[PDB]
């Protein structure tokens, strides 16, 4: 079955006075592949995809500040905080040019870095990614009341911080196949203490929905503007029925974005890595071999 373990040797690097954990495997020469997780996951989400890429390319998978095995400073965990820590992480590792593999909130981080540093990005593989949601009618109806609730300091904090709903409920609702107890426990591990759940609550409060927050909407519009014009090689994974990227939309996006190939993963919602890791990892490895890296 789909693997549940996390065998990777831990690595830590000091970034802005705090430690960030990261997976680092594969050959030391060549162009590295940087994997960026989102909410409420960690590098664990890449555990079954990296084994297809690591034979031929270095794979680096950080845990975002406040998540995974990374330290937990008392921040707001705004998107800007993740930007500062990820920018510093990339420079601390001395990375020059990279290929990005990104998902969901990791996709906003990755696209925003790539737009600012296009000479250092040799390709982007992405899935169930963040674009502006113009009105609440474009948010998936089955998750609309909950995300509206999450975006409050009363009910949203009760749900996400006190009751851990993002881990116990939203995470499984983003995977078609059933998650095992061992997998759930890996996802729960960084957040056993409620107070550490701050990033899980700030993230949905940052989503660019109905114009709000305006600073995030502007930033995401900007990287989308770039992505529709840039010749950067693109690999878009999508699933059925999907969540943010449904099949008919994925096909339209791939034909509109330059130098984009789209790959059907089969059944999927948001966390496509949990529904078909072997296809995602084997397609990434094949696509890397086509790049000038």
Ligand X SMILES: CN(C)c1ccc2c(-c3cc(C(=O)NCCOCCOCCCCCCCl)ccc3C(=O)O)c3ccc(=[N+](C)C)cc-3oc2c1
The residues binding ligand X (CB under 6 A) are 38, 104-105, 130, 143, 146, 163, 165, 168-170, 172-174, 207, 243-244, 270
Subset of residues 135 to 164 that bind Cl ion, contact rule: CB under 5 A: none
Shortest separation between residue 236's beta carbon and ligand X, angstroms: 14
Shortest separation between residue 39's beta carbon and Cl ion, angstroms: 4
Residue 65's contacts (CB-CB under 8 Å, 6 or more residues apart) are 15, 18, 20, 71, 73, 75, 77, 81, 82, 85, 199
Candidates 39, 70, 107, 273: give the one binding Cl ion (CB under 5 A).
39
Nearest CB to Cl ion, comparing residues 131 and 234: 131
Shortest separation between residue 293's beta carbon and ligand X, angstroms: 27
In this chain, which stretch among 35-43, 56-64, 239-247, 275-283 interacts with Cl ion, using CB under 5 A? 35-43
Which of Cl ion, ligand X, none binds 172 (CB below 5-8 Å, type-dependent)?
ligand X
Candidates 203, 223, 238, 287: give the one binding Cl ion (CB under 5 A).
203
Which of ligand X, Cl ion, none binds 244 (CB below 5-8 Å, type-dependent)?
ligand X
Which of Cl ion, ligand X, none binds 36 (CB below 5-8 Å, type-dependent)?
none
Which of ligand X, Cl ion, none binds 165 (CB below 5-8 Å, type-dependent)?
ligand X
Shortest separation between residue 52's beta carbon and Cl ion, angstroms: 27
Shortest separation between residue 89's beta carbon and ligand X, angstroms: 20
Shortest separation between residue 227's beta carbon and ligand X, angstroms: 15
Q: Is 40 in the site for Cl ion (CB under 5 A)?
A: no
Residue ranges in contact with Cl ion by CB under 5 A: 39, 203-204
């Amino acid at each position: 079955g789909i693997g549940t373990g996390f065998p990777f040797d831990p690595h830590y690097v000091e970034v802005l006075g705090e430690r960030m954990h990261y997976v680092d495997v594969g050959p030391r020469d060549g162009t590295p592949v940087l994997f960026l997780h989102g909410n409420p996951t960690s590098s664990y989400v890449w555990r079954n995809i990296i084994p297809h890429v690591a034979p031929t390319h270095r794979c680096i998978a950080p845990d975002l500040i406040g998540m995974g095995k990374s330290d937990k400073p008392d921040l707001g965990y705004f998107f800007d905080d993740h930007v500062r820590f990820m920018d510093a992480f990339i420079e601390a590792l001395g990375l020059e040019e990279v290929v990005l593999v990104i998902h969901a909130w990791g996709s906003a981080l990755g696209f925003h870095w790539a737009k600012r540093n296009p000479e250092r990005v040799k390709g982007i593989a992405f899935m169930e990614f963040i674009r502006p949601i113009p009105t609440w009618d474009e948010w998936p109806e089955f998750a609309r009341e909950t995300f509206q609730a999450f975006r409050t300091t009363d009910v949203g904090r009760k749900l996400i911080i006190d009751q851990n709903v993002f881990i116990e409920g939203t995470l499984p609702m983003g995977v078609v196949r059933p998650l095992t107890e061992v997998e759930m426990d890996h996802y729960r591990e960084p957040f056993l203490n409620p107070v550490d759940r701050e990033p899980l609550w700030r993230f949905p409060n940052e989503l660019p929905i109905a114009g709000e927050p305006a600073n995030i909407v502007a930033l995401v519009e900007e990287y989308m503007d770039w992505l529709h014009q840039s010749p950067v090689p693109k690999l878009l994974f999508w699933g059925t029925p999907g969540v943010l990227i449904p099949p008919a939309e994925a096909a339209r996006l791939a034909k509109s974005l330059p130098n984009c190939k789209a790959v059907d993963i089969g059944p999927g919602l948001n966390l496509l890595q949990e529904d078909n890791p072997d296809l995602i990892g084997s397609e990434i490895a094949r696509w890397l071999s086509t790049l000038e890296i």
